Amino acid sequence: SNAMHRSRVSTVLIDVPREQASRSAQFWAGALGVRADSPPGEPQYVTLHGALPGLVTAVQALEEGEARYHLDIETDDVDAEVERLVGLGAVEESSWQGCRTLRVPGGQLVCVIPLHSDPDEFAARATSWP
Amino acid sequence: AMHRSRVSTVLIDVPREQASRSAQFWAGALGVRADSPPGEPQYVTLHGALPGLVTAVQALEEGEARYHLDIETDDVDAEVERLVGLGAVEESSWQGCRTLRVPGGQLVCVIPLHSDPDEFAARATSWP
């Protein structure tokens, strides 16, 4: 059933109500000793450059809801990866911050997102399914 | 001090009754082996989930599901003081760890050294 495809955790997100976003980025920049800025086309994100090895880390401004963390699973087939994770007991929730979003067994949220990495890096770190 | 710190650990905190199902899911979701370290039955390590870091499911005696990060340091007291200076607030000892509520509301723990020294040095920042 499940199409052959690849995935891995690519991104660690610090989700904060929009009003606290700049204060949060200020803290994490000082706490981690990192540079912080927003990418073009992504003003809701403040990248914490080089915070974690082999991953992207960012503060994401929430338009509604309470502060949390979440992980993004990067994949070359979003539909197939959502299907695979639902097969493992995850449940798809409403679109959340423009991402396909699942509640996993235990209660945490994860987002499934498309490719945003150097192909050679993704091939070196992604897990092949099945 | 000078002292050094880095984020070393990503924790998936779940009510104890849900801990087995969580570990099962994450092992399957990430394609990793999952097992508890000797002396640390409250954790199920997700081996190699995030290379350069440790990732684990932590069984909570109470409270709701969340994630948190551990900041690893060679001077726990100094690092807590430094993070408090940046606006973090120390909460009561939580799951046997020094635990801070950061600006924004997330939790972090400050923990002692537990990594290959060369890995720590490659990833850590020095603080006056």
Side-chain angles (χ1 to χ4, degrees), chain A residues 2-130, chain B:
Chain A
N2 194 237
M4 300 180 99
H5 69 286
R6 305 163 301 154
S7 77
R8 50 75 175 269
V9 172
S10 71
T11 323
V12 173
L13 288 315
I14 298 158
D15 301 294
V16 299
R18 58 176 178 76
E19 283 168 305
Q20 291 296 141
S22 69
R23 180 74 196 82
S24 169
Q26 180 188 343
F27 170 80
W28 287 103
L32 304 184
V34 302
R35 309 164 68 88
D37 40 67
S38 300
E42 300 186 281
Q44 72 277 24
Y45 290 107
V46 174
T47 311
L48 298 165
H49 293 283
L52 301 177
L55 294 168
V56 174
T57 309
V59 176
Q60 189 174 182
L62 294 165
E63 289 301 304
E64 62 178 15
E66 308 310 315
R68 61 173 66 240
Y69 300 96
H70 80 272
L71 304 177
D72 291 349
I73 293 170
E74 180 185 19
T75 188
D76 55 6
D77 192 333
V78 171
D79 288 350
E81 183 67 354
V82 169
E83 178 178 278
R84 193 184 68 84
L85 298 169
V86 167
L88 293 174
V91 169
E92 186 165 8
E93 307 287 352
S94 297
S95 179
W96 181 63
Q97 295 163 121
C99 297
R100 302 282 297 275
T101 298
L102 316 180
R103 192 180 298 285
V104 310
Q108 288 79 10
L109 297 181
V110 299
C111 296
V112 182
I113 64 171
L115 298 175
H116 63 93
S117 300
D118 291 353
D120 290 3
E121 178 191 327
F122 187 76
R125 280 292 176 274
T127 299
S128 292
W129 308 108
Chain B
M2 192 147 257
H3 77 280
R4 295 166 294 159
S5 78
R6 74 176 189 123
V7 172
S8 68
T9 320
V10 173
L11 289 311
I12 298 159
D13 303 302
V14 301
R16 187 167 76 268
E17 76 190 337
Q18 294 291 327
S20 284
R21 291 175 181 79
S22 172
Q24 286 168 12
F25 167 80
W26 286 105
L30 305 182
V32 298
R33 293 168 185 248
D35 45 72
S36 300
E40 303 189 295
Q42 73 276 28
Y43 295 108
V44 173
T45 315
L46 298 164
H47 292 297
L50 306 170
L53 300 170
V54 171
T55 307
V57 178
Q58 178 166 213
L60 298 179
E61 290 299 325
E62 94 287 319
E64 286 192 326
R66 64 172 67 244
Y67 300 91
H68 80 272
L69 305 176
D70 292 349
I71 291 169
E72 177 185 27
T73 185
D74 56 354
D75 192 332
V76 171
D77 285 320
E79 181 67 356
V80 171
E81 182 181 345
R82 191 187 71 86
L83 294 168
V84 165
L86 299 172
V89 178
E90 182 159 14
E91 310 279 31
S92 299
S93 189
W94 178 62
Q95 300 280 125
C97 294
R98 300 292 292 280
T99 303
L100 316 181
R101 176 72 61 86
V102 308
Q106 287 86 1
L107 293 180
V108 294
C109 295
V110 182
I111 64 167
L113 293 182
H114 63 92
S115 298
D116 291 349
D118 287 355
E119 179 186 70
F120 184 68
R123 292 306 315 180
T125 297
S126 311
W127 306 110

